[PDB]
């Protein structure tokens, strides 16, 4: 349940579709000095090379083998990345696609990222190897062989998720091949895993697989370190399967988090920020110590999976920064920051027809992440984790780690504020008028740099400065026209 990050590092970033060499560099030049705890990488195992449409991001969720050979790089490059990141104290978490192999209708051949042969029709994946009796064809009871109704917990686990050949996870052989793959990764140095499509696997089968896993590599981690496990289970209520069914295996993605935060920040259905005072279990969320939270993920930022139209993304920059800021300042859950790439989003009748577009590329080859002088990224990589407002809130969370949620204030509408012990204080204005008021910050008297509008550099603030008096009070002024309608100050932004 523990992330295995360095003490004081409290977040992981999803460097979606990034190449291994770029992640390795990012660890050394940025993630390490900026206090990021780790990186969730895209599936590192060989997948189907899909040409129609052209190399969609989702082709990586169709395994062909467990060879570490993808568009992100080969095994040597993967190992090089894990080693270099671990050497600077930044962890690597692998997106483990272990519930299935490729779509059952994909043409047999060698159209795979490493050239391995596979035949979906005959259930033949010799590179693993898996054969017909390693899948759930006979176990599934639906007429189509695919998942048709989520109100039936059994078919959700034994049938094909949108046609993806479903592995027979009850078999020791299958459990062992998956464990062989995961242990290869652990011994390489990975600190944990995102278990893809966990709702589609029986809690007990996941447990059986986890029981076969090694402790983390003792060259970098303390003896007895268990891999961090966060299971992707979309539970927004209304279905028989609950996130809690997976608590015995590790943490679980809390999709209610971004869904509700999005509706609140967008002020949909009469919701408003003042309602966030009891954010957390009070909103029907799972226990904080089991939650992996995020504003958006690779699926819902483009209409896939679940979360709805309320999901905030980099496309909604201003509101997105505020949502991410609230998440990073609030003690609930373990935080994951999204880092995306820009694609030609094209809405037709309310839906994005280009929701399949893969990462920036030249004839199928993923483009490198270029770093501009102003620290932003080029080649269409968004790099939200490099936005000052987000990067500084990632540090805010580190600085206030362990401090209690306190000194809450709200105007009964959308102007709220709260502190984290005596280490940090944050103020938000999402109303259509100015927020000008003196608030109790719980902070020691002094001059603090607002880390949203600026930075503390060479003993000075580059942005707004906040003055806390002997009584712990400070005046905050945020116009509804402000570039970023929120201010955040903490112990390490004090002059
Ligand atoms: O030997 C030729 C044969 O090799 C490969 O077969 C593998 C199976 O596909 C794979 O399932 C596994 O078989 C095991 C069963 O799953 C398990 O329940 C129990 O019966 O033990 C079996 C043997 O370990 O391993 C075999 C052998 O690697 C390949 O996939 C076939 O196409 C090929 O004919
Ligand atoms: O530290 C680097 C810079 O980080 C910040 O720049 C961010 C913006 O804050 C962010 O909103 C985004 O720019 C968007 C713009 O503000 C938004 O209105 C529009 O819809 O989309 C824009 C994307 O083109 O991305 C940049 C980083 O690329 C910070 O504001 C800035 O001062 C820092 O220099
Ligand atoms: C802070 O900024 C002021 C104004 O530019 C400058 O005079 C002062 O020397 C700076 N202090 C430090 C520590 O650099
Ligand atoms: C937590 O993520 C990991 C898996 C469960 C455990 O004991 N450690
Ligand atoms: Ca399944
Ligand atoms: Cl996820």
From Swiss-Prot:
It catalyses: Endohydrolysis of (1->4)-alpha-D-glucosidic linkages in polysaccharides containing three or more (1->4)-alpha-linked D-glucose units. Detected in pancreas (at protein level). Binds 1 Ca(2+) ion per subunit. Binds 1 Cl(-) ion per subunit. SUPFAM superfamilies: (Trans)glycosidases, Glycosyl hydrolase domain. GO terms for cellular component: extracellular exosome; extracellular region; extracellular space. It is an enzyme of class 3 (hydrolase). Its EC number is 3.2.1.1. Chloride binds at residues 194, 297, 336. The active site is at 196 (nucleophile), 232 (proton donor). GO terms for biological process: carbohydrate catabolic process; carbohydrate metabolic process; polysaccharide digestion. Pfam families: Alpha-amylase, Alpha-amylase_C. Ca(2+) binds at residues 99, 157, 166, 200. Belongs to the glycosyl hydrolase 13 family. This is Pancreatic alpha-amylase. It comes from Homo sapiens.
């Amino acid at each position: 349940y523990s992330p295995n990050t360095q003490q004081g590092r409290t977040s992981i970033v999803h460097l979606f579709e990034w190449r291994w060499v770029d992640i390795a560099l990012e660890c050394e030049r940025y993630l390490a000095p900026k206090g990021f705890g780790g990186v969730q990488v895209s599936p590192p195992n060989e997948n189907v090379a899909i040409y129609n449409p052209f190399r969609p991001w989702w082709e990586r969720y169709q395994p062909v083998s467990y060879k570490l050979c993808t568009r992100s790089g080969n095994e040597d490059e993967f190992r090089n990345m894990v080693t270099r990141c671990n050497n600077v104290g930044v962890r690597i978490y692998v997106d483990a696609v272990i519930n299935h192999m490729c779509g059952n209708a994909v043409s047999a051949g060698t159209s795979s990222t490493c050239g391995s042969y596979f035949n979906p029709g005959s259930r033949d994946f010799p590179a693993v190897p898996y054969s017909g009796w390693d899948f759930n064809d006979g176990k599934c009871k639906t007429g189509s062989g695919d998942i048709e109704n989520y109100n039936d917990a059994t078919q959700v686990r034994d049938c094909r998720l949108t046609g993806l050949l479903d592995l027979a996870l009850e078999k020791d052989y299958v459990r062992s091949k998956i464990a062989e793959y995961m242990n290869h990764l652990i011994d390489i140095g990975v600190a944990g895993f995102r278990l893809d499509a966990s709702k589609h696997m029986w809690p007990g089968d996941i447990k059986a697989i986890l029981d076969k896993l090694h402790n983390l590599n003792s060259n970098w981690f303390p003896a007895g370190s268990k891999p961090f496990i966060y299971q992707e289970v979309i539970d927004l209520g209304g279905e028989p399967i609950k996130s809690s069914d997976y608590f015995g295996n590790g943490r679980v993605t809390e999709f209610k988090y971004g869904a509700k935060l999005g509706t609140v920040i967008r002020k949909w259905n009469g919701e408003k920020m003042s309602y966030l005072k009891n954010w957390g279990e009070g909103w029907g969320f799972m226990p904080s110590d089991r939650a992996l939270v995020f504003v958006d993920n690779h699926d819902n930022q483009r209409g896939h999976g679940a979360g709805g139209a309320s999901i905030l993304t980099f496309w909604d920059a201003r509101l997105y920064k505020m949502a991410v800021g609230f998440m990073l300042a609030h003690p609930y859950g373990f935080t994951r920051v999204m880092s995306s790439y820009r694609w030609p989003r094209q809405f037709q009748n309310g839906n994005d027809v280009n929701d399949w577009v893969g990462p920036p590329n030249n004839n199928g080859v993923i483009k490198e992440v270029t770093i501009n002088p102003d620290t932003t990224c080029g080649n269409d990589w968004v790099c939200e984790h490099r936005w000052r407002q987000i990067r500084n809130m990632v540090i805010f969370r580190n600085v206030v780690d362990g401090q209690p949620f306190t000194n809450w204030y709200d105007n009964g509408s959308n102007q709220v504020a709260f502190g984290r012990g005596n280490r940090g204080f944050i103020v938000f204005n999402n109303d259509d008028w100015s927020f000008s008021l003196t608030l109790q910050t719980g902070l020691p008297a002094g001059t603090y740099c607002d880390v949203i509008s600026g930075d503390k550099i060479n003993g000075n603030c580059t942005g707004i400065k906040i003055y806390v008096s002997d009584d712990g009070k400070a005046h905050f002024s945020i116009s509804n026209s402000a570039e970023d309608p929120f201010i955040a100050i903490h112990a390490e932004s004090k002059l």
